[PDB]
Design a binder for this molecule. Structure first.
Ligand SMILES: CC(C)(COP(=O)(O)OP(=O)(O)OC[C@H]1O[C@@H](n2cnc3c(N)ncnc32)[C@H](O)[C@@H]1OP(=O)(O)O)[C@@H](O)C(=O)NCCC(=O)NCCS
Length: 128
């Protein structure tokens, strides 16, 4: 079982629907990425199991939003994905994770602490 993390360089209307299924509060924008704003899609067996948006502004890593499917509250997928990103993106020493006003942040921080992130003055930081 390997989580296939794909980079969303092109958005079909099929992807469009499933993305809105992951973010039911998000009105369908243009869905437009660049070499900095990089949206990665973790598809486990063809289907979206997790979605994360990382804005690599230069060599700085800004992690905004991350949603794994609700049922996947413990299946390695989340940490696997985060580690995978940090293992395939070298040089980026400053990983900054936004809180995004998430209320499941209690659970999120528990995930963060057990994975290897620290909370500093308004968000999670991982310099390394
Ligand atoms: C929270 C969430 C990431 C758990 O997803 P996941 O892919 O199962 O995460 P993992 O399986 O990698 O993490 C389980 C590990 O995280 C840590 N952890 C601690 N508390 C945890 C918790 N309450 N839930 C999940 N992981 C937790 C542990 O180290 C655990 O390791 P273990 O399985 O060996 O015990 C998933 O439910 C999710 O993404 N939901 C929220 C998406 C969302 O709405 N986010 C807002 C973006 S605005």
């Amino acid at each position: 079982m390997k989580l296939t993390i794909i980079r969303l360089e092109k958005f079909s209307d099929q992807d469009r629907i499933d993305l809105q299924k992951i973010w039911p509060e998000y009105s369908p924008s243009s869905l437009q990425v660049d070499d900095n704003h990089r949206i990665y899609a973790a598809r486990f067996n063809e289907r979206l199991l997790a979605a994360v948006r990382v804005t690599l502004s230069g060599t700085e890593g800004a992690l905004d939003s991350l949603r794994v499917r609700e049922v996947t509250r413990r299946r390695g997928v989340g940490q696997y994905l985060l580690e995978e990103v940090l293992r395939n993106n070298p040089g980026v020493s400053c990983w900054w994770m936004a809180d995004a006003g998430v209320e499941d942040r209690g659970v999120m921080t528990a995930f963060m602490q057990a994975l290897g992130f620290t909370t500093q003055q308004g968000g999670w930081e991982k310099c390394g």
